[PDB]
Amino acid sequence: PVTLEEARYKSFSIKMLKDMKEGVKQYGPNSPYMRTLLDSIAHGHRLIPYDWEILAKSSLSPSQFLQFKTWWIDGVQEQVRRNRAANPPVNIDADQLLGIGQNWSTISQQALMQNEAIEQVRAICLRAWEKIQDPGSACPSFNTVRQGSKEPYPDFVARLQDVAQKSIADEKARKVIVELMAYENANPECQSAIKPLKGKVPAGSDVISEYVKACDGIG
Amino acid sequence: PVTLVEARYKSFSIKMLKDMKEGVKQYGPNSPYMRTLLDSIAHGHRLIPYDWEILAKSSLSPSQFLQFKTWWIDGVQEQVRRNRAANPPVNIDADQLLGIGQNWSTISQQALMQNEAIEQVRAICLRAWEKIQDPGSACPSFNTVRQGSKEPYPDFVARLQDVAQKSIADEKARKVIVELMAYENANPECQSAIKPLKGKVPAGSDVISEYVKACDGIG
Amino acid sequence: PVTLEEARYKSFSIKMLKDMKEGVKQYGPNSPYMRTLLDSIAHGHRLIPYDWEILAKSSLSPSQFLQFKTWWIDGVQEQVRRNRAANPPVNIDADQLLGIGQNWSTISQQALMQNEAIEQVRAICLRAWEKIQPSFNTVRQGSKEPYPDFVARLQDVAQKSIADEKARKVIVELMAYENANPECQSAIKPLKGKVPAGSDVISEYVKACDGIG
Amino acid sequence: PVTLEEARYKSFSIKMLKDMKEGVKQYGPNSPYMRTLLDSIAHGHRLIPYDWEILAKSSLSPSQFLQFKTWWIDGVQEQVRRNRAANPPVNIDADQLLGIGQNWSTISQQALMQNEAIEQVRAICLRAWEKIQDPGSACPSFNTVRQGSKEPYPDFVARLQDVAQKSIADEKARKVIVELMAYENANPECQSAIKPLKGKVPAGSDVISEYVKACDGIGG
Amino acid sequence: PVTLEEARYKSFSIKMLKDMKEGVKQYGPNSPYMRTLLDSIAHGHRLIPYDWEILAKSSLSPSQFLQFKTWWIDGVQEQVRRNRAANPPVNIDADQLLGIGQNWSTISQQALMQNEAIEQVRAICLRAWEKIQDPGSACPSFNTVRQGSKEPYPDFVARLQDVAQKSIADEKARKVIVELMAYENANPECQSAIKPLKGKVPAGSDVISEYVKACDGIGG
């Protein structure tokens, strides 16, 4: 990170990388413990585009690093598209968010980065990180995920919320699809207990909270 | 190792060799955690060849050690060949880059070297470390590695970037070979999905990070 | 145990001493790891033989310590011969190299021992450590075995049961040429006999037998 | 071609069309004889895009003309992109190349081009001629070109170098892939007789020469 | 060629490359007609290694050009020895023959060479051209070529002389090998017709003239 006294760079401690690689190998890079460690490290310091590549190469398996770099590129493409239609078009070009080129390829140039580019790249890398699968499987579709019988109900909502966290871009459009896909793919006998479905939902109480409160008895 | 008007010697800690041995035993000497620890050691110190000898003794298996030593010899052969064709050819002989012979056999001899010999031997040892094979098996050719059905495409490109790092010496030759071997040797299906591509590569992008996006939902 | 412009003695720190015992019990005292770690311990500091006694006694089983002490005695007895015949004869006597006697049995006496004795005793003890403890011909490079793993196994057994370096450095390359896989055995025959500069023979056999997987 | 120094366009004689047509028919349009004829035609004269269209319609199969025109289009497509990214920018655009447009449709319009677009279209059209497919079949990929049994080395390396000439643009990328692939797809006998010489430049020569010098006598 | 009028240099015509390529295509690379035409060029002018490179690459198959370059490379490693093996050694190095290096890699450097160098490159270029193969076979050794049953004996001795023209450097041994192999590998019919005629010179006739004279009428 940097420290601004003006603006010198020091590398990571070794102890942070050690338990970072420990946690990534043990729990998988989307279990929420690592997810809340990562933004804690991100907000507790002041990161640069050179540092994220160091941490990602040091932590993930070699197969996953290409996926992380791919969704980094796909994020910065949409970011540099949306950053030109503003008023004024704010001067943050593409290459400064990747740390390459004739002016941002090394450390001593990148230590002078202003706050707005940091606030870009933090959100872009954090959006990027959760598009990384467990190293055995590929992300399926909503038509495939459907709970059977003899199985507890909230595990189904957990799996469906994980898939909808992966494959949906906007968080409001994420928030809409989940509860109706949870209703539409449940068990038969549980679904009857949810048959009110509307008008038992006042404004303010979160709707996905009430559904499990219906189906807690069936085990 | 060596600090600096006069130069005095120091050794390694016992803990750094301890977790070095632990890491090489657990993860494999080309898994990128060790590969980003080792250059973090190297670029932040001053490594005389005796300390490279200590790091080679104390960490690898018995079978890996002569595998390291042979490619050390075969690298320093070509380096002392290319040193003689310069203008003027720099007077850094063979045995200053191996630590043997009556001129460079003790620590007090080696402590008084120049920066050029250090910055040559660093690149030589780091080049030598990469072609250490895994203690399971030996490296195959290029025509052996082909993904089959029911296999994620980033795993295939991970294995292909792994095999081409050992054989081919230069870097630009690697970054020419890997995408031709990627586009050829793939599964048939998303072969089609990259068939309209090679259309363009925009500014702020490589080429290999497009195929992995285009073959994302196929497994 | 450094001078600092005066002689200053300091003990071993307790973590450095502690890790050595797990290092010995995990692999063994002639494993490559502990041997090179010991060599990197030695050349970085000044090792008064009292500290060598501490580091020896604090890291082995009692039988291995007995073997180390007796081969230390043998080595200093052999070296005090060749410390005489050179001209001028150096005054390096046996009590200076064992920490015993009326003028070498305290820390302040050994704290001013000069460099030539240190460079002698280091080559004594690292020679001593190697010897801490009968069929040969049953080594065969099998089917689909990589060649550099074969030369390591034959490097192992020839160390154990020939017990002389001037002999066993000649038996190996004779045995390395004979006992290989046949399909790469003919790939060595051009390099047979001829030698390049800057290397020995078994460094050059591995050059010509890489992609034979 | 056009000459400036009585400066007008002259249409070349019918015997040039004659031996051009025989040369493209009997040998193939990427045999080295047609290669060394075409550049000796091109450099000693001054060609307009109408002349290239005349010669290409006059001395090819219809399928060859069809394959020629489209890689000509693609060459103009790349040259237009690499035009404007120079400082100061140059006034070379698309319809100045293809011989169409309201300002470049007739012969008297395009006949008055100076010495830059002529060089650019001479750079493009020759590469497009080089990309023209053999009348036999389509250009295959690098893994079905493999020296089987009973086949000699010094035409298998040429069949390799042909496909490495078509599908890769810059020649510094062409060298290393053919130097690598000349070994990996080889028959086992030349493999065994070529692995002692792997990765050594002996004296003042390329690698392919001593490669083919090694396993000469393999035809049994 | 060079005309020597600071000198002058030119490329070839158009017609000469045309019938050169036609002759090497439709008959072979070392058929006698192409052989004497190449001797007529190689003595009637003064050639430069760049011109040899042009006349090679313009008029061979893409296969055979690598073989030409290969024996051109291995023909200079003897001249490097035998230019310093005699006393006094002449000043001819490796890079002057192949036209490469920093001192001989253009026309204006190579335009002013000396006559013994041109003679050495003429000898080594002709000896290079002789060792070129056909289209798609490999030249065998002597122990596999034999006369077939119901085969005309001059064809068999022509194939023997063609094989012995390649694999043996000196031409004096080419006399004494092929006639001794003629009686050896022949058919039993020509053997029975030839056995009284072992080694007899009547008057001024070489031995290969009489064997075909004796085994002429074989029509069974």
Numbering used by the authors:
A (entry chain B): 1 to 5, 22 to 235
B (entry chain A): 1 to 4, 21 to 235
C (entry chain C): 1 to 5, 22 to 149, 156 to 235
D (entry chain G), E (entry chain H): 1 to 5, 22 to 236
Structure paper excerpt:
Further, we assemble particles from HML2 CArec in vitro and use single-particle cryogenic electron microscopy (cryo-EM) to determine the high-resolution structures of four different types of Fullerene shell assemblies.
However, a comparison of the pentamer with the D6 polar hexamer, which obeys strict six-fold symmetry, shows that although helix α1–α2–α3 packing is maintained, in hexamers, the CArec monomers are positioned at a greater radius and are rotated away from the symmetry axis, relative to pentamers. As a result, the relative tilt angle between adjacent α1 helices is reduced and helix α2 comes closer to α3 of the neighbouring monomer allowing the additional monomer to be accommodated into the hexameric ring. In the D6 hexamer, because of the expanded radius, for the CTD to maintain the interaction with the neighbouring NTD it is rotated by a further 15° and there is an accompanying 2 Å shift and tilt between α6 and α7. Again, the pentamer conformation remains invariant and the hexamer six-fold symmetry is broken by NTD domain movements, changes in the NTD–CTD linker conformation and in the intra-hexamer CTD–NTD hydrogen bonding configuration and in the CTD radial position when interacting with either a neighbouring pentamer or hexamer.
